[PDB]
Write a protein that binds this DNA or RNA. Structure first.
Ligand code: MG
Ligand code: MG
Ligand code: MG
Ligand code: MG
Ligand code: MG
Ligand code: MG
Ligand code: MG
Ligand code: MG
Ligand code: MG
Ligand code: MG
Ligand code: MG
Ligand code: MG
Ligand code: MG
Ligand code: ZN
Lengths: 216, 53, 120, 122, 114
RNA sequence: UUGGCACCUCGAUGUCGGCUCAUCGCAUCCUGGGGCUGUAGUCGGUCCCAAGGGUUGGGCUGUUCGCCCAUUAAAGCGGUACGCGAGCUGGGUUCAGAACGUCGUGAGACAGUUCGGUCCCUAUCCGUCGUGGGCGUAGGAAAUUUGAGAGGAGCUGUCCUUAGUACGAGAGGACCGGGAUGGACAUACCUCUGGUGUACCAGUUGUCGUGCCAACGGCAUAGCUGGGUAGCUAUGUGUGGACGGGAUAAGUGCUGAAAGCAUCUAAGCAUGAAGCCCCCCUCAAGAUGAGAUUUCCCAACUUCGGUUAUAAGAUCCCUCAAAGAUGAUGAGGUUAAUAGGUUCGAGGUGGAAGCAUGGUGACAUGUGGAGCUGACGAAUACUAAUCGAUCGAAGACUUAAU
């Protein structure tokens, strides 16, 4: 079981051995370091905490997340590492295989590895029931005054209320999503890029977490 | 459509908890010492960033 | 880009009027949103002036309004001529940043953020 | 993308000229058919003296579509028209001649006789 | 350019053996076709009606009339499936996309050689 | 269901069907597990367990029904004010017009028919879907988290092989097991195929301007037309319901007496479903039971009660977008690439203007893949993120241990 953190760059295509067009997503997974190792003894569970992407060192009057705060700088320093923008825990990996301050390389994954990619999906803002919940529209003509409305939200005196889980307009997207059983097409060590077959959630520049597929 | 019951003074006033205006984001102008809006030209002396506007 | 609460034709027309006015006066008081849009339009006009070629003059003529500026000498110069003369000459050695916006604060009528946009 | 009520030209000498799609076979709620899919159809226009008559309910295989098909290599083939061939239960054509080009996807479907008869397989 | 990482990873995919062509040109595309076990080259000859995209994602569309039926083949430019491309003729056209040809036939559909 | 009764409602509880959105029961339509069979096999019949998921499109009719066409694994039956009109429709029915048949002397009338015929409402409360602020969580903070709980998902076809084997006179033709590939559905995403693309490029009509020519601008749906970037998108591209574990149902037993036999049950011990609890995905410590880990901050005053601004930190304000109704979130704020500009590209368009040349001319060709170009890549402090201000600890008691 392996895990790495990367940023989504975009999509492209690669030609397979038989000349099949393979839709791919380019992920850059440079600057991964094991910040901390969590153990059952101390934390009650085993995990490695990986910090990805170096951030600038602490300064006195930092006004942004670009510069590490004193708490963050200390945590990273314990691992003898530079402060990191993104930090995530991998429970799947074996703690013994890793040492604190160790670099996690893209070469950990190899071509043909089946992986699960986790990321936050693209935000869509306030969205109606048709787009958010894939509901059918009402008639567009024939006297209709019902087009993009959600429909009846209940029954009558029996229940005299709307049940929890009724599908209504609200904020859509910006949700954690895991796409399972994706494949590593290629690993570029020089550019620190992993090529994942298919597409993964979130905008370009978004954080992606790549893990060995849970289902095998 | 219409209110079934009148709103009590208590309920109305609870609703008005967040109905308020904040103090303007103002700082003392360095040149004249009168308060000015931050990132705005000082109206009193007509100076911004140590230069007359 | 900003819609500025106008339709496409109205938006384009107002931006031409604003750009020409800024070129003539060299400083104008307007709303922040309009100023933020106009800075792009004017600077692209300055770019054309700095190139100075006939094609650039014709490209600038598409945007600039036909107005007459009365000089102290009493000579009359069109906005296009001022752009391709004095304004272009001033900013020859400067690369971008031909305008600045200074916030003035809200106005009484609608609370709109008044700003001054000026060349330099 | 052929659906219910789609009219297709018939690319054969079976005696049917135009058919209308009664059904797309291959599952409940199945909406569309493309090249290689079998459809149930009624004959709307028939050439006189042909074997197949107007108003006959028959089965046909789709040979060309405007939608076209995408191949695994990322290549596409699209046709100017939507065409079908009236077929027997064995998948053999009712008519003796196939008219116009057919997609190679018919070979996958095991419509070998049609593929053989077709002037060009692309 | 495009994102530099995308260009770096897909640079190997690009083919440098391909000839230069424009929409309106007549191309003889030699396509590697597998029928059962057997593999052979089948030539599709037609006018290029469209070229779009960039890098490894670039595609082109060739149009031919077969037995009175228009057929369009869209190909990825850098697909290994194309053995070779030959430019038979260079055509005079006034636009990048020749969609108007789809509704034309015979003399109306003719394109003048450069 | 048709009724009976007349108990809430006549200072109004809108009524058929459809549409939208569902939700529940199981007397189960399909799929899963069984028993018996007048069960050879393949198919069936009947009964038991089982509600996890699934349960199509048309013709006719206002229809509900129902019949029919074509499918499907199946086209389940019921409740929810015959669910749902402050969500929609308004064809039927149930106003005023008119007509037919019929009845009436007549005015008129008819669960007979025919044609036509106004569906209002800015959401207060609960409820529901989203999204913030306060305080708490015995110091003040930054990150990473455990998961009590809760939600989601849960469906199936066909084909190949085992095997023309079992079975069977033949016809026909298994199980069990192993593969492959679909339908429907869900979800993420725009590389591809397409859609849109009102500050992209080009062609073109009428008319009015920039004095005229040339070149341009206004108006005509964006005047119209052909393309089209980013973004947003489906019909496009990936992925999923896998493999399993534990306990069970109807069942099937092993051992076994009461009851010397027998007996699956009483003691004891196994096996056994798409179902149950997990496994998978998502939320989640206001889980007031407020959890854990790592790191940061740690002083003076004092009436000795405690206070104080400051620390770490975080905001105001400002430049913004991957975020967004607003908040919020995230990228930045000069010790700076946050945006604009500028410069260089990608993609798009398709050959600018000017000049020259050929033609009587409309035009053509060359200069020259030209010129132009929103959102995309990179670089560059030229412009703007100024100067500032505000908030924010000093850690209660008891007991035990050390
Ligand atoms: Mg609909
Ligand atoms: Mg409407
Ligand atoms: Mg009584
Ligand atoms: Mg009342
Ligand atoms: Mg039962
Ligand atoms: Mg009802
Ligand atoms: Mg109602
Ligand atoms: Mg009516
Ligand atoms: Mg009556
Ligand atoms: Mg794109
Ligand atoms: Mg005009
Ligand atoms: Mg003219
Ligand atoms: Mg007018
Ligand atoms: Zn001042």
């Amino acid at each position: 079981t392996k895990g790495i953190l990367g940023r989504k760059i975009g999509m492209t295509q690669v030609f397979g051995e038989n000349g099949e067009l393979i839709p791919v997503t380019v992920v850059e997974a440079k600057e991964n370091v094991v910040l901390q190792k969590k153990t059952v003894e101390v934390d009650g569970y085993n995990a490695i905490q990986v910090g990805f992407e170096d951030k600038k060192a602490y300064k006195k009057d930092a006004k942004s997340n670009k510069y590490a705060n004193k708490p963050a700088e200390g945590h990273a320093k314990k691992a003898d590492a530079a402060p990191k923008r993104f930090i995530r825990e991998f429970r799947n990996v074996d703690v013994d295989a890793y040492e604190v301050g160790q670099e996690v390389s893209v070469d950990t994954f190899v071509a043909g590895d089946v992986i699960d990619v986790t990321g936050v999906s693209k935000g869509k803002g306030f969205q109606g029931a048709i787009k958010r919940h894939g509901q059918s529209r009402g008639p567009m003509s024939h006297g209709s005054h019902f087009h993009r409305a959600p429909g009846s939200v209940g029954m009558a005196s029996d229940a005299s209320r709307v049940f929890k889980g009724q599908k209504m307009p609200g904020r859509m997207g910006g949700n954690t999503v895991t796409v399972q059983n994706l494949e590593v097409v290629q690993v570029d060590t020089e550019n620190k890029v992993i090529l994942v077959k298919g597409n993964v959630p979130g905008p370009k520049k978004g954080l992606v977490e790549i893990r060995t597929s849970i289902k095998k | 459509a219409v209110p079934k019951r009148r709103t009590s003074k208590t309920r109305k006033n609870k609703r008005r908890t967040h109905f308020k205006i904040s103090v303007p984001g103002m700082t003392e102008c360095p040149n004249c010492g009168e308060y000015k809006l931050s990132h705005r030209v000082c109206k009193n002396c007509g100076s911004y960033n140590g230069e007359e506007v | 880009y900003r819609k500025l609460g106008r339709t496409s034709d109205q938006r384009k027309a107002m931006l031409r009027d604003l750009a020409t006015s800024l070129i003539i006066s060299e400083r104008i008081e307007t709303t922040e949103a309009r100023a933020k849009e106009v800075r792009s339009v004017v600077e692209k006009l300055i770019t054309l002036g700095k190139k100075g070629d006939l094609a650039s003059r014709r490209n600038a003529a598409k945007t600039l309004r036909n107005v007459e500026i009365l000089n102290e000498d009493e000579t009359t110069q069109t906005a296009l001529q001022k752009l391709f003369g004095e304004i272009a000459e001033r900013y020859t050695e400067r690369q971008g940043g031909y305008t600045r916006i200074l916030k003035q604060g809200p106005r009484r009528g609608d609370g709109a953020e008044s700003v001054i946009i000026e060349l330099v | 993308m052929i659906q219910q009520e789609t009219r297709l030209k018939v690319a054969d000498n079976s005696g049917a000229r135009e058919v209308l799609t009664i059904k797309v076979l291959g599952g409940s709620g199945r909406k569309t058919a493309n090249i290689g899919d079998v459809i149930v159809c009624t004959v709307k226009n028939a050439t006189p003296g042909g074997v197949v008559k107007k108003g006959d309910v028959v089965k046909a295989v789709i040979v060309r579509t405007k939608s076209g098909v995408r191949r695994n290599d990322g290549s596409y083939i699209k046709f100017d028209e939507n065409a079908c061939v009236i077929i027997r239960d064995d998948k053999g054509p009712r008519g003796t001649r196939i008219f116009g080009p057919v997609a190679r996807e018919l070979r996958e479907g095991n419509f070998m006789k049609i593929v053989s008869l077709a002037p060009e397989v692309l | 350019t495009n994102h530099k990482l995308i260009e770096a990873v897909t640079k190997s995919q690009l083919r440098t053996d391909l000839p230069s062509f424009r929409p309106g040109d007549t191309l003889r595309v030699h396509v590697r076709i597998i029928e059962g076990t057997r593999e052979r080259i089948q030539v599709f000859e037609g006018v290029v009606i469209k070229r779009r995209g960039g890098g490894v994602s670039e595609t082109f569309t060739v149009r031919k009339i077969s037995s009175g039926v228009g057929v369009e083949r869209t190909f990825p430019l850098h697909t290994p499936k194309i053995e070779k491309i030959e430019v038979k003729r260079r055509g005079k056209v006034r636009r990048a996309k020749l969609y108007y040809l789809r509704s034309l036939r015979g003399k109306a559909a003719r394109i003048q050689e450069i």
